[PDB]
């Protein structure tokens, strides 16, 4: 029983994280076979993120302008390429602590593990979503860019996240392993506001299903509702619409449980409704809503890697 | 900037963990030079759980009783011993991947990152705090015995924690890794209840200036206090006392902040004796107690292992 905010073990992720220097900038890197991936402004100066021209600062750089450090030995770049915001560093060498990988572009509401890095070296984990916003809350410092988000099933790591930018409100943004941002984030250090953090209803579902399953009841109303009932509740308090897709995805937690999932759906307007009166629930005195339906059963289960 | 539940990085502790099978039970083991540390109750039926006589039922048991596996290789055990409430097994090979390590008992408030695993495999990491009642409060299914809880400074993985029991409250009992048990809790499945489950001040002051420090700063009110004043109102809403010692280990953060300690108390008085208002401070309707003043420093610094 009880249930914890579990991040996936990184020791797959430790074995890949090395240290990228381009001139003035050190961050981090990802070294997988004979390639390391990095944010891409690891070539900027502090002025130049003002206002960037990434392929016009490339011109200037070549194999050995990159320093790639992977403990206390120095890897040997043999060529390079910018893809959309990352930049991939072949090396010489294939790392030898390459995991079974895959590189996924997630949805917003997944939820994934960050190794956070400095220098190249780990320095903690912790479970993040990607925010329906296309932000994450996460916990980065100055020299952590290139740390990276991933899932694991089994010995295989899904790499989906790489840290590029904090944002003036102290939130995050990066790119999947290809490059691309999530959401409309770019690599320049300019004006960008977030959008509406709105909440990930079918998680927060699926945590009041993980909290009946450890014996948090308390909150397990006497009524039910309808999808576009419980959607016009959504809407006033900034949740996203309950689909018929999540309904399904939340089957297996119903059926554990023997609560309806739309049972559930009026469990929560009357919560959101009236709060929770200084009650918690699994610990908390909010509506988590960064643990997915398959987070639960995995947590629930047992499902080891 | 950003806040968040840390652990850790898995990996030195990942290369540590086997499965331990001895008649009818299977748990983990932590396995670190040529011996395996695991939970006595390894050797228990279900049957014997309710009033064993660990020293009688060993009598039965033979190092080739206990079945010892790191992935799909067995290891040969060359002898067996009964240290309190863990059993050591010695086998014939050291681990390869045995990390610099250190044994330590910690404190009530301290915190650890708790490697779940199942079977010899690791399922997830997350963070805990030893409880002022000697508990945890952790996610362990069936299976999870003999996960281990650590901290680690450098290269220096420090084991301060082996899961035993789950009481019937669903928290959670173990020992050290000299088989100690925290608290007065026993390997016996019968009536055992908590006590008081207190609210680590020290580490709430600490995380109210790692709040400061990331930008939430709504709460800091405009009062000081005394550490008696302060204490008396910490024994009404049942939170450990303060004492001097706990101001000296917030003096960094003081002088981070500029905020003295007793200020930030008053402020915590204030927020105990009049709530949140539906505010939440780093992402929590909660005042959260499980970062230490050192958890607080690591995460605000980019502390690297
Ligand atoms: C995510 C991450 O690691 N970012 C990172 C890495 C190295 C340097 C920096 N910058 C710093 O300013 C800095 C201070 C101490 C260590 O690093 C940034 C940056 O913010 N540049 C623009 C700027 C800075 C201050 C005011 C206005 C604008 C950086 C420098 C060089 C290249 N990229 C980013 C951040
Ligand atoms: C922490 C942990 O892993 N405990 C563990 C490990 C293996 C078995 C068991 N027991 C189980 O009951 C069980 C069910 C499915 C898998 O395991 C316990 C146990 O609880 N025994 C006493 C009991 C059970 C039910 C009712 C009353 C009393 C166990 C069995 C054998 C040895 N030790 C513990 C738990």
């Not at 990228?20 to 050190?26: I, K, R």
């Not at 930049?87 to 390459?98: E, M």
């Not at 790591?157 to 490059?179: I, N, Q, R």
């Not at 759906?265 to 919560?271: D, R």
Request: charged letters at 15%.
């Amino acid at each position: 029983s009880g249930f914890r905010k579990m991040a996936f073990p990184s020791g797959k992720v430790e074995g890949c994280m090395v240290q990228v220097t381009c001139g003035t900038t050190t961050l981090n890197g990802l070294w997988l076979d004979d390639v390391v991936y990095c944010p891409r402004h690891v070539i900027c100066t502090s002025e130049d993120m003002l206002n960037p021209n990434y392929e016009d600062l490339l011109i200037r750089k070549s194999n050995h302008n990159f320093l790639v450090q992977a403990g206390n030995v120095q890897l040997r770049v043999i060529g390079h390429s910018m893809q959309n915001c990352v930049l991939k560093l072949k090396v010489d060498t294939a790392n030898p602590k390459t995991p079974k990988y895959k590189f996924v572009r997630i949805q917003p509401g997944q939820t994934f593990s960050v190794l956070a890095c400095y220098n190249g070296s780990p320095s903690g984990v912790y479970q993040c979503a990607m925010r329906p916003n296309f932000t994450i809350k996460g916990s980065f410092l100055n020299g952590s860019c290139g740390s990276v988000g991933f899932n694991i099933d089994y010995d295989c790591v899904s790499f989906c996240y790489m840290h590029h930018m904090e944002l003036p409100t102290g939130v995050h943004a990066g790119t999947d392993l290809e490059g691309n941002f999530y959401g409309p984030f770019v690599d320049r250090q300019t004006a960008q506001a977030a959008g509406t953090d709105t909440t990930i209803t079918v998680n927060v579902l699926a945590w009041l299903y993980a909290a009946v399953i450890n014996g948090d009841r308390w909150f397990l109303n006497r009524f039910t509702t309808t999808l576009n009932d419980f959607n016009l509740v959504a809407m006033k308090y900034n949740y996203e619409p309950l689909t018929q897709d999540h309904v399904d995805i939340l089957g297996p937690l119903s059926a554990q449980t023997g609560i309806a999932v739309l049972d559930m759906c009026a469990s929560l307007k009357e919560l959101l409704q009236n709060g929770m009166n200084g009650r918690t629930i699994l610990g908390s005195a909010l509506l988590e809503d960064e643990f997915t339906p398959f987070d639960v059963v995995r947590q629930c289960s047992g499902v080891t890697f």
